[PDB]
mmCIF file of all heavy atoms in Angstrom:
data_model
loop_
_atom_site.group_PDB
_atom_site.id
_atom_site.type_symbol
_atom_site.label_atom_id
_atom_site.label_comp_id
_atom_site.label_asym_id
_atom_site.label_seq_id
_atom_site.Cartn_x
_atom_site.Cartn_y
_atom_site.Cartn_z
ATOM 1 N N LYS A 1 -52.182 29.712 -119.622
ATOM 2 C CA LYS A 1 -51.797 29.291 -118.276
ATOM 3 C C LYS A 1 -52.019 27.798 -118.069
ATOM 4 O O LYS A 1 -51.187 27.120 -117.453
ATOM 5 C CB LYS A 1 -52.575 30.087 -117.229
ATOM 6 C CG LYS A 1 -52.442 29.528 -115.817
ATOM 7 C CD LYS A 1 -53.316 30.281 -114.837
ATOM 8 C CE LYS A 1 -53.152 29.713 -113.441
ATOM 9 N NZ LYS A 1 -54.230 30.177 -112.537
ATOM 10 N N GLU A 2 -53.136 27.262 -118.571
ATOM 11 C CA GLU A 2 -53.399 25.838 -118.379
ATOM 12 C C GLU A 2 -52.357 24.997 -119.094
ATOM 13 O O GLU A 2 -51.861 24.012 -118.543
ATOM 14 C CB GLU A 2 -54.800 25.475 -118.873
ATOM 15 C CG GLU A 2 -55.923 26.054 -118.034
ATOM 16 C CD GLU A 2 -57.241 25.331 -118.240
ATOM 17 O OE1 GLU A 2 -57.223 24.102 -118.468
ATOM 18 O OE2 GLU A 2 -58.296 25.991 -118.169
ATOM 19 N N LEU A 3 -52.002 25.390 -120.321
ATOM 20 C CA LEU A 3 -50.993 24.675 -121.092
ATOM 21 C C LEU A 3 -49.660 24.643 -120.357
ATOM 22 O O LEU A 3 -48.982 23.608 -120.322
ATOM 23 C CB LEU A 3 -50.844 25.349 -122.461
ATOM 24 C CG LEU A 3 -49.843 24.807 -123.472
ATOM 25 C CD1 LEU A 3 -50.147 23.343 -123.755
ATOM 26 C CD2 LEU A 3 -49.911 25.621 -124.757
ATOM 27 N N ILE A 4 -49.282 25.773 -119.756
ATOM 28 C CA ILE A 4 -47.997 25.932 -119.087
ATOM 29 C C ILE A 4 -47.943 25.125 -117.790
ATOM 30 O O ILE A 4 -46.882 24.604 -117.408
ATOM 31 C CB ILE A 4 -47.767 27.442 -118.865
ATOM 32 C CG1 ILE A 4 -47.477 28.132 -120.214
ATOM 33 C CG2 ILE A 4 -46.635 27.704 -117.898
ATOM 34 C CD1 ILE A 4 -47.484 29.689 -120.168
ATOM 35 N N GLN A 5 -49.075 24.978 -117.105
ATOM 36 C CA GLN A 5 -49.080 24.337 -115.796
ATOM 37 C C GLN A 5 -49.419 22.849 -115.825
ATOM 38 O O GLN A 5 -49.231 22.186 -114.801
ATOM 39 C CB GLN A 5 -50.042 25.080 -114.851
ATOM 40 C CG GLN A 5 -49.572 26.515 -114.586
ATOM 41 C CD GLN A 5 -50.293 27.223 -113.445
ATOM 42 O OE1 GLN A 5 -51.452 26.929 -113.141
ATOM 43 N NE2 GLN A 5 -49.601 28.173 -112.812
ATOM 44 N N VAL A 6 -49.892 22.304 -116.946
ATOM 45 C CA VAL A 6 -50.206 20.869 -117.045
ATOM 46 C C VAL A 6 -49.064 20.021 -116.485
ATOM 47 O O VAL A 6 -47.924 20.163 -116.936
ATOM 48 C CB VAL A 6 -50.488 20.451 -118.500
ATOM 49 C CG1 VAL A 6 -50.553 18.931 -118.594
ATOM 50 C CG2 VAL A 6 -51.780 21.025 -118.987
ATOM 51 N N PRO A 7 -49.304 19.116 -115.515
ATOM 52 C CA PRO A 7 -48.191 18.355 -114.918
ATOM 53 C C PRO A 7 -47.867 17.059 -115.663
ATOM 54 O O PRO A 7 -47.979 15.946 -115.120
ATOM 55 C CB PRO A 7 -48.707 18.090 -113.498
ATOM 56 C CG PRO A 7 -50.161 17.921 -113.677
ATOM 57 C CD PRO A 7 -50.573 18.855 -114.816
ATOM 58 N N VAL A 8 -47.449 17.188 -116.919
ATOM 59 C CA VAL A 8 -46.791 16.103 -117.634
ATOM 60 C C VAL A 8 -45.437 16.614 -118.105
ATOM 61 O O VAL A 8 -45.147 17.808 -118.031
ATOM 62 C CB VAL A 8 -47.622 15.564 -118.819
ATOM 63 C CG1 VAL A 8 -48.910 14.905 -118.321
ATOM 64 C CG2 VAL A 8 -47.920 16.672 -119.836
ATOM 65 N N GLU A 9 -44.600 15.691 -118.586
ATOM 66 C CA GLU A 9 -43.298 16.076 -119.113
ATOM 67 C C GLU A 9 -43.454 16.816 -120.443
ATOM 68 O O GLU A 9 -44.320 16.492 -121.256
ATOM 69 C CB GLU A 9 -42.394 14.845 -119.289
ATOM 70 C CG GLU A 9 -42.148 14.043 -117.990
ATOM 71 C CD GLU A 9 -40.906 13.149 -118.043
ATOM 72 O OE1 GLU A 9 -40.011 13.390 -118.876
ATOM 73 O OE2 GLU A 9 -40.817 12.197 -117.240
ATOM 74 N N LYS A 10 -42.605 17.819 -120.663
ATOM 75 C CA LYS A 10 -42.648 18.619 -121.880
ATOM 76 C C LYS A 10 -41.223 18.897 -122.330
ATOM 77 O O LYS A 10 -40.281 18.842 -121.534
ATOM 78 C CB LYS A 10 -43.383 19.945 -121.670
ATOM 79 C CG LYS A 10 -44.792 19.788 -121.132
ATOM 80 C CD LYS A 10 -45.328 21.100 -120.613
ATOM 81 C CE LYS A 10 -46.449 20.841 -119.618
ATOM 82 N NZ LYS A 10 -46.830 22.093 -118.948
ATOM 83 N N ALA A 11 -41.076 19.216 -123.612
ATOM 84 C CA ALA A 11 -39.767 19.590 -124.123
ATOM 85 C C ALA A 11 -39.923 20.486 -125.344
ATOM 86 O O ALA A 11 -40.938 20.452 -126.043
ATOM 87 C CB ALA A 11 -38.913 18.366 -124.478
ATOM 88 N N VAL A 12 -38.894 21.285 -125.587
ATOM 89 C CA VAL A 12 -38.784 22.110 -126.779
ATOM 90 C C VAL A 12 -37.466 21.760 -127.451
ATOM 91 O O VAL A 12 -36.416 21.766 -126.799
ATOM 92 C CB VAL A 12 -38.849 23.608 -126.428
ATOM 93 C CG1 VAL A 12 -38.254 24.445 -127.529
ATOM 94 C CG2 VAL A 12 -40.286 24.023 -126.218
ATOM 95 N N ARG A 13 -37.522 21.446 -128.740
ATOM 96 C CA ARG A 13 -36.320 21.340 -129.562
ATOM 97 C C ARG A 13 -36.210 22.570 -130.456
ATOM 98 O O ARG A 13 -37.143 22.895 -131.189
ATOM 99 C CB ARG A 13 -36.320 20.069 -130.418
ATOM 100 C CG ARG A 13 -35.036 19.947 -131.240
ATOM 101 C CD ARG A 13 -35.012 18.765 -132.205
ATOM 102 N NE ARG A 13 -33.967 18.989 -133.202
ATOM 103 C CZ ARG A 13 -34.131 18.861 -134.511
ATOM 104 N NH1 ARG A 13 -35.265 18.421 -135.023
ATOM 105 N NH2 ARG A 13 -33.123 19.172 -135.329
ATOM 106 N N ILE A 14 -35.069 23.247 -130.376
ATOM 107 C CA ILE A 14 -34.751 24.429 -131.168
ATOM 108 C C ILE A 14 -33.628 24.056 -132.129
ATOM 109 O O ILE A 14 -32.606 23.515 -131.704
ATOM 110 C CB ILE A 14 -34.315 25.595 -130.264
ATOM 111 C CG1 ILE A 14 -35.462 26.043 -129.353
ATOM 112 C CG2 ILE A 14 -33.792 26.778 -131.090
ATOM 113 C CD1 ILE A 14 -34.969 26.770 -128.140
ATOM 114 N N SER A 15 -33.810 24.343 -133.414
ATOM 115 C CA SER A 15 -32.765 24.144 -134.416
ATOM 116 C C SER A 15 -32.404 25.502 -135.001
ATOM 117 O O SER A 15 -33.273 26.184 -135.547
ATOM 118 C CB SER A 15 -33.232 23.181 -135.513
ATOM 119 O OG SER A 15 -32.183 22.929 -136.442
ATOM 120 N N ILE A 16 -31.131 25.890 -134.894
ATOM 121 C CA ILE A 16 -30.690 27.239 -135.270
ATOM 122 C C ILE A 16 -30.597 27.352 -136.790
ATOM 123 O O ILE A 16 -29.902 26.559 -137.440
ATOM 124 C CB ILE A 16 -29.333 27.572 -134.624
ATOM 125 C CG1 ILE A 16 -29.407 27.516 -133.093
ATOM 126 C CG2 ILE A 16 -28.830 28.936 -135.099
ATOM 127 C CD1 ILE A 16 -30.323 28.543 -132.475
ATOM 128 N N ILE A 17 -31.287 28.341 -137.356
ATOM 129 C CA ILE A 17 -31.222 28.608 -138.795
ATOM 130 C C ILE A 17 -30.181 29.673 -139.116
ATOM 131 O O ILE A 17 -29.396 29.518 -140.049
ATOM 132 C CB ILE A 17 -32.607 29.014 -139.340
ATOM 133 C CG1 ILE A 17 -33.612 27.874 -139.224
ATOM 134 C CG2 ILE A 17 -32.492 29.482 -140.824
ATOM 135 C CD1 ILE A 17 -35.067 28.333 -139.449
ATOM 136 N N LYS A 18 -30.135 30.760 -138.361
ATOM 137 C CA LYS A 18 -29.128 31.799 -138.545
ATOM 138 C C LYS A 18 -28.240 31.792 -137.310
ATOM 139 O O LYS A 18 -28.744 31.893 -136.186
ATOM 140 C CB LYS A 18 -29.779 33.169 -138.762
ATOM 141 C CG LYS A 18 -28.852 34.222 -139.347
ATOM 142 C CD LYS A 18 -28.334 35.162 -138.271
ATOM 143 C CE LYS A 18 -27.070 35.908 -138.736
ATOM 144 N NZ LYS A 18 -25.866 35.007 -138.762
ATOM 145 N N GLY A 19 -26.933 31.645 -137.520
ATOM 146 C CA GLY A 19 -26.024 31.435 -136.404
ATOM 147 C C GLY A 19 -25.880 32.664 -135.523
ATOM 148 O O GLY A 19 -26.047 33.801 -135.958
ATOM 149 N N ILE A 20 -25.571 32.423 -134.248
ATOM 150 C CA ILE A 20 -25.466 33.501 -133.271
ATOM 151 C C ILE A 20 -24.444 33.077 -132.229
ATOM 152 O O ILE A 20 -24.253 31.883 -131.980
ATOM 153 C CB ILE A 20 -26.854 33.812 -132.646
ATOM 154 C CG1 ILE A 20 -26.850 35.133 -131.867
ATOM 155 C CG2 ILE A 20 -27.323 32.673 -131.750
ATOM 156 C CD1 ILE A 20 -28.197 35.447 -131.205
ATOM 157 N N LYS A 21 -23.773 34.059 -131.625
ATOM 158 C CA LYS A 21 -22.920 33.782 -130.473
ATOM 159 C C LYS A 21 -23.765 33.528 -129.229
ATOM 160 O O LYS A 21 -24.874 34.055 -129.092
ATOM 161 C CB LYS A 21 -21.966 34.943 -130.196
ATOM 162 C CG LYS A 21 -20.935 35.181 -131.288
ATOM 163 C CD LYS A 21 -20.052 36.372 -130.950
ATOM 164 C CE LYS A 21 -19.206 36.773 -132.158
ATOM 165 N NZ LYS A 21 -18.295 37.932 -131.885
ATOM 166 N N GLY A 22 -23.196 32.758 -128.293
ATOM 167 C CA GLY A 22 -23.936 32.372 -127.098
ATOM 168 C C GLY A 22 -24.307 33.539 -126.198
ATOM 169 O O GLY A 22 -25.405 33.573 -125.635
ATOM 170 N N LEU A 23 -23.402 34.507 -126.036
ATOM 171 C CA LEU A 23 -23.700 35.608 -125.120
ATOM 172 C C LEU A 23 -24.887 36.445 -125.580
ATOM 173 O O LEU A 23 -25.776 36.710 -124.749
ATOM 174 C CB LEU A 23 -22.459 36.479 -124.891
ATOM 175 C CG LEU A 23 -22.678 37.714 -124.004
ATOM 176 C CD1 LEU A 23 -23.159 37.331 -122.613
ATOM 177 C CD2 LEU A 23 -21.401 38.544 -123.897
ATOM 178 N N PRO A 24 -24.987 36.880 -126.841
ATOM 179 C CA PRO A 24 -26.197 37.606 -127.255
ATOM 180 C C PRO A 24 -27.472 36.802 -127.089
ATOM 181 O O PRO A 24 -28.499 37.370 -126.711
ATOM 182 C CB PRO A 24 -25.930 37.914 -128.732
ATOM 183 C CG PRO A 24 -24.448 37.940 -128.839
ATOM 184 C CD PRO A 24 -23.943 36.921 -127.892
ATOM 185 N N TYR A 25 -27.441 35.505 -127.407
ATOM 186 C CA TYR A 25 -28.618 34.655 -127.218
ATOM 187 C C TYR A 25 -29.019 34.574 -125.752
ATOM 188 O O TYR A 25 -30.200 34.703 -125.411
ATOM 189 C CB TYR A 25 -28.356 33.248 -127.760
ATOM 190 C CG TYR A 25 -29.522 32.309 -127.539
ATOM 191 C CD1 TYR A 25 -30.697 32.454 -128.267
ATOM 192 C CD2 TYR A 25 -29.453 31.294 -126.583
ATOM 193 C CE1 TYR A 25 -31.779 31.605 -128.054
ATOM 194 C CE2 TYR A 25 -30.524 30.434 -126.370
ATOM 195 C CZ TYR A 25 -31.686 30.598 -127.104
ATOM 196 O OH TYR A 25 -32.761 29.754 -126.875
ATOM 197 N N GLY A 26 -28.053 34.303 -124.876
ATOM 198 C CA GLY A 26 -28.363 34.182 -123.466
ATOM 199 C C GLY A 26 -28.826 35.495 -122.876
ATOM 200 O O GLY A 26 -29.705 35.514 -122.009
ATOM 201 N N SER A 27 -28.253 36.614 -123.337
ATOM 202 C CA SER A 27 -28.663 37.921 -122.836
ATOM 203 C C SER A 27 -30.081 38.262 -123.266
ATOM 204 O O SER A 27 -30.811 38.931 -122.520
ATOM 205 C CB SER A 27 -27.688 38.998 -123.312
ATOM 206 O OG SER A 27 -26.388 38.756 -122.809
ATOM 207 N N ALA A 28 -30.485 37.818 -124.459
ATOM 208 C CA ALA A 28 -31.860 38.008 -124.890
ATOM 209 C C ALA A 28 -32.822 37.162 -124.063
ATOM 210 O O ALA A 28 -33.911 37.631 -123.726
ATOM 211 C CB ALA A 28 -31.998 37.677 -126.380
ATOM 212 N N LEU A 29 -32.459 35.905 -123.761
ATOM 213 C CA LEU A 29 -33.257 35.114 -122.823
ATOM 214 C C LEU A 29 -33.389 35.838 -121.490
ATOM 215 O O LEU A 29 -34.486 35.943 -120.936
ATOM 216 C CB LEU A 29 -32.639 33.735 -122.590
ATOM 217 C CG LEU A 29 -32.738 32.604 -123.604
ATOM 218 C CD1 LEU A 29 -32.078 31.354 -123.004
ATOM 219 C CD2 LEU A 29 -34.161 32.320 -124.035
ATOM 220 N N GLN A 30 -32.272 36.348 -120.967
ATOM 221 C CA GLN A 30 -32.298 37.075 -119.701
ATOM 222 C C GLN A 30 -33.267 38.247 -119.756
ATOM 223 O O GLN A 30 -34.057 38.462 -118.828
ATOM 224 C CB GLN A 30 -30.891 37.551 -119.348
ATOM 225 C CG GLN A 30 -30.818 38.419 -118.096
ATOM 226 C CD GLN A 30 -29.395 38.895 -117.825
ATOM 227 O OE1 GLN A 30 -28.714 39.385 -118.727
ATOM 228 N NE2 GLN A 30 -28.934 38.734 -116.595
ATOM 229 N N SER A 31 -33.227 39.026 -120.838
ATOM 230 C CA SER A 31 -34.134 40.163 -120.958
ATOM 231 C C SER A 31 -35.593 39.717 -120.947
ATOM 232 O O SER A 31 -36.416 40.270 -120.206
ATOM 233 C CB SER A 31 -33.825 40.956 -122.232
ATOM 234 O OG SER A 31 -32.549 41.562 -122.157
ATOM 235 N N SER A 32 -35.935 38.715 -121.763
ATOM 236 C CA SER A 32 -37.330 38.289 -121.869
ATOM 237 C C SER A 32 -37.826 37.625 -120.582
ATOM 238 O O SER A 32 -38.991 37.808 -120.192
ATOM 239 C CB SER A 32 -37.497 37.334 -123.047
ATOM 240 O OG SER A 32 -37.147 37.963 -124.262
ATOM 241 N N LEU A 33 -36.973 36.833 -119.917
ATOM 242 C CA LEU A 33 -37.395 36.196 -118.669
ATOM 243 C C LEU A 33 -37.537 37.211 -117.543
ATOM 244 O O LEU A 33 -38.469 37.112 -116.729
ATOM 245 C CB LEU A 33 -36.404 35.095 -118.266
ATOM 246 C CG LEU A 33 -36.345 33.931 -119.262
ATOM 247 C CD1 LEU A 33 -35.222 32.960 -118.959
ATOM 248 C CD2 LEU A 33 -37.652 33.226 -119.200
ATOM 249 N N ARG A 34 -36.613 38.176 -117.459
ATOM 250 C CA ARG A 34 -36.738 39.243 -116.470
ATOM 251 C C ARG A 34 -38.051 39.992 -116.635
ATOM 252 O O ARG A 34 -38.747 40.253 -115.647
ATOM 253 C CB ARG A 34 -35.552 40.203 -116.566
ATOM 254 C CG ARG A 34 -35.577 41.332 -115.525
ATOM 255 C CD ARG A 34 -34.308 42.194 -115.610
ATOM 256 N NE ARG A 34 -34.151 42.801 -116.925
ATOM 257 C CZ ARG A 34 -33.000 42.893 -117.585
ATOM 258 N NH1 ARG A 34 -31.869 42.423 -117.075
ATOM 259 N NH2 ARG A 34 -32.987 43.455 -118.795
ATOM 260 N N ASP A 35 -38.431 40.307 -117.878
ATOM 261 C CA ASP A 35 -39.719 40.964 -118.125
ATOM 262 C C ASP A 35 -40.866 40.181 -117.486
ATOM 263 O O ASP A 35 -41.715 40.744 -116.789
ATOM 264 C CB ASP A 35 -39.983 41.102 -119.632
ATOM 265 C CG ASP A 35 -39.207 42.232 -120.289
ATOM 266 O OD1 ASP A 35 -38.759 43.164 -119.577
ATOM 267 O OD2 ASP A 35 -39.052 42.197 -121.537
ATOM 268 N N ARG A 36 -40.899 38.869 -117.711
ATOM 269 C CA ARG A 36 -42.012 38.066 -117.223
ATOM 270 C C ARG A 36 -41.979 37.918 -115.709
ATOM 271 O O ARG A 36 -43.034 37.912 -115.063
ATOM 272 C CB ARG A 36 -41.994 36.707 -117.915
ATOM 273 C CG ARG A 36 -42.468 36.785 -119.358
ATOM 274 C CD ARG A 36 -41.842 35.696 -120.212
ATOM 275 N NE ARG A 36 -42.379 35.745 -121.568
ATOM 276 C CZ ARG A 36 -42.028 36.638 -122.481
ATOM 277 N NH1 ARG A 36 -41.068 37.523 -122.254
ATOM 278 N NH2 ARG A 36 -42.649 36.639 -123.658
ATOM 279 N N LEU A 37 -40.785 37.797 -115.118
ATOM 280 C CA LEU A 37 -40.688 37.646 -113.667
ATOM 281 C C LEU A 37 -41.030 38.950 -112.948
ATOM 282 O O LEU A 37 -41.671 38.932 -111.888
ATOM 283 C CB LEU A 37 -39.283 37.169 -113.288
ATOM 284 C CG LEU A 37 -38.926 35.779 -113.813
ATOM 285 C CD1 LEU A 37 -37.402 35.603 -113.820
ATOM 286 C CD2 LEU A 37 -39.591 34.751 -112.917
ATOM 287 N N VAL A 38 -40.602 40.088 -113.493
ATOM 288 C CA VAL A 38 -40.955 41.366 -112.880
ATOM 289 C C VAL A 38 -42.467 41.597 -112.971
ATOM 290 O O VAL A 38 -43.087 42.124 -112.040
ATOM 291 C CB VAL A 38 -40.151 42.510 -113.524
ATOM 292 C CG1 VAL A 38 -40.630 43.873 -113.017
ATOM 293 C CG2 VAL A 38 -38.652 42.339 -113.245
ATOM 294 N N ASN A 39 -43.088 41.150 -114.063
ATOM 295 C CA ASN A 39 -44.542 41.229 -114.198
ATOM 296 C C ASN A 39 -45.272 40.499 -113.071
ATOM 297 O O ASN A 39 -46.359 40.932 -112.655
ATOM 298 C CB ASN A 39 -44.957 40.650 -115.548
ATOM 299 C CG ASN A 39 -46.427 40.830 -115.833
ATOM 300 O OD1 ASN A 39 -46.904 41.956 -115.998
ATOM 301 N ND2 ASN A 39 -47.160 39.718 -115.910
ATOM 302 N N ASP A 40 -44.707 39.399 -112.568
ATOM 303 C CA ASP A 40 -45.339 38.595 -111.526
ATOM 304 C C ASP A 40 -44.866 38.950 -110.125
ATOM 305 O O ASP A 40 -45.325 38.327 -109.159
ATOM 306 C CB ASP A 40 -45.088 37.098 -111.766
ATOM 307 C CG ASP A 40 -45.830 36.552 -112.983
ATOM 308 O OD1 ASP A 40 -46.553 37.320 -113.647
ATOM 309 O OD2 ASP A 40 -45.696 35.339 -113.272
ATOM 310 N N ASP A 41 -43.972 39.930 -109.993
ATOM 311 C CA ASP A 41 -43.343 40.270 -108.716
ATOM 312 C C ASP A 41 -42.518 39.105 -108.180
ATOM 313 O O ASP A 41 -42.483 38.836 -106.974
ATOM 314 C CB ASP A 41 -44.379 40.733 -107.692
ATOM 315 C CG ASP A 41 -44.980 42.064 -108.058
ATOM 316 O OD1 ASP A 41 -44.249 43.078 -107.964
ATOM 317 O OD2 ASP A 41 -46.157 42.095 -108.488
ATOM 318 N N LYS A 42 -41.834 38.414 -109.089
ATOM 319 C CA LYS A 42 -41.014 37.259 -108.745
ATOM 320 C C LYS A 42 -39.536 37.493 -109.025
ATOM 321 O O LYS A 42 -38.757 36.535 -109.001
ATOM 322 C CB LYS A 42 -41.488 36.017 -109.511
ATOM 323 C CG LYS A 42 -42.848 35.514 -109.111
ATOM 324 C CD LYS A 42 -43.321 34.431 -110.057
ATOM 325 C CE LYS A 42 -44.586 33.772 -109.526
ATOM 326 N NZ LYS A 42 -45.387 33.170 -110.637
ATOM 327 N N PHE A 43 -39.113 38.724 -109.286
ATOM 328 C CA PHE A 43 -37.705 38.970 -109.600
ATOM 329 C C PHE A 43 -36.957 39.393 -108.335
ATOM 330 O O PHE A 43 -36.505 40.530 -108.187
ATOM 331 C CB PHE A 43 -37.578 40.007 -110.718
ATOM 332 C CG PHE A 43 -36.230 40.002 -111.409
ATOM 333 C CD1 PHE A 43 -35.765 38.865 -112.061
ATOM 334 C CD2 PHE A 43 -35.423 41.137 -111.402
ATOM 335 C CE1 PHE A 43 -34.524 38.870 -112.702
ATOM 336 C CE2 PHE A 43 -34.192 41.134 -112.031
ATOM 337 C CZ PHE A 43 -33.746 39.992 -112.685
ATOM 338 N N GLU A 44 -36.826 38.438 -107.414
ATOM 339 C CA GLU A 44 -36.076 38.652 -106.187
ATOM 340 C C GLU A 44 -34.617 38.260 -106.413
ATOM 341 O O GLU A 44 -34.200 37.960 -107.535
ATOM 342 C CB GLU A 44 -36.714 37.876 -105.038
ATOM 343 C CG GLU A 44 -38.020 38.479 -104.536
ATOM 344 C CD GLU A 44 -38.765 37.542 -103.586
ATOM 345 O OE1 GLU A 44 -38.126 36.979 -102.667
ATOM 346 O OE2 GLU A 44 -39.987 37.343 -103.772
ATOM 347 N N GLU A 45 -33.823 38.250 -105.340
ATOM 348 C CA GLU A 45 -32.395 37.974 -105.474
ATOM 349 C C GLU A 45 -32.132 36.587 -106.065
ATOM 350 O O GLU A 45 -31.220 36.421 -106.885
ATOM 351 C CB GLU A 45 -31.698 38.132 -104.115
ATOM 352 C CG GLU A 45 -32.274 37.273 -102.994
ATOM 353 C CD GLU A 45 -31.665 37.561 -101.621
ATOM 354 O OE1 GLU A 45 -30.643 38.282 -101.557
ATOM 355 O OE2 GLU A 45 -32.217 37.063 -100.609
#
């Protein structure tokens, strides 16, 4: 939690090793983020 909330600028660079279509990748992000937001009671409209 402390690492995530530190108020400095941060970035992630991702380099794709095995190719994927955008929709499956984005849908997997959606699944994982929904899990975390529902855990916090933050998955509102």
Side-chain angles (χ1 to χ4, degrees):
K1 169 185 181 195
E2 291 199 34
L3 180 57
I4 289 169
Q5 296 192 332
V6 170
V8 295
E9 301 200 21
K10 304 165 202 171
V12 160
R13 182 185 162 229
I14 296 158
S15 183
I16 300 296
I17 295 167
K18 197 259 161 287
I20 193 182
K21 294 179 191 181
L23 177 60
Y25 178 71
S27 298
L29 284 183
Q30 175 182 48
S31 294
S32 299
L33 296 171
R34 182 176 59 222
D35 283 339
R36 286 152 176 76
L37 296 160
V38 173
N39 186 66
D40 290 359
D41 291 289
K42 293 171 171 155
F43 199 60
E44 287 169 47
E45 56 186 349

